[PDB]
Amino acid sequence: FHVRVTLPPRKVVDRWNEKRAMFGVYDNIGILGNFEKHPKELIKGPIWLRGWKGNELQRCIRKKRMVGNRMFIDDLHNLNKRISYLYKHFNRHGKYR
Amino acid sequence: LRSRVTDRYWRVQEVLKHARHFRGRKNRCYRLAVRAVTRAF
């Protein structure tokens, strides 16, 4: 439980950099833009998670459908085992049933 | 986001400060102190 004996260098965070000042600027593009682009067309990230939400099982299934043929051999096997275990756990295990 | 307890030093000090006058290993070891402190109260 020994704690550090020297004060760390305090992080001087600037609240007014380019990222924080312009954070969430075009969130209302659809409302104030004649409904030409839904706000879900601004999300940056995985191909299969742009404007989508789900639990762990529906996420792994969705990943296998879209980018499954582009994955590596080892990653393709690990995903299959994760799908099978979640399928068995969610349906054949639990308390409320 | 890996969350770890950092104030664990004060977690055990709140218990050992009531067990400073005990005899044996109860005044040093935390596992033996809590059972002694709880019975003390």
């Binding site: 704690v3 550090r4 004996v5 020297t6 004060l7 760390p8 305090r10 | 950092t6 104030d7 030093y9």
Partner: peptide
């Protein structure tokens, strides 16, 4: 190295207490 500052600073309150006990001020 655990992230944070409360743990680091709170111990500095303890280090001052030990120094006073070892070397009491006039």
């Amino acid at each position: 190295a655990k992230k944070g500052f409360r743990a680091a600073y709170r111990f500095q309150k303890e280090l001052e207490r030990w120094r006073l006990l070892r070397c009491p001020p006039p």
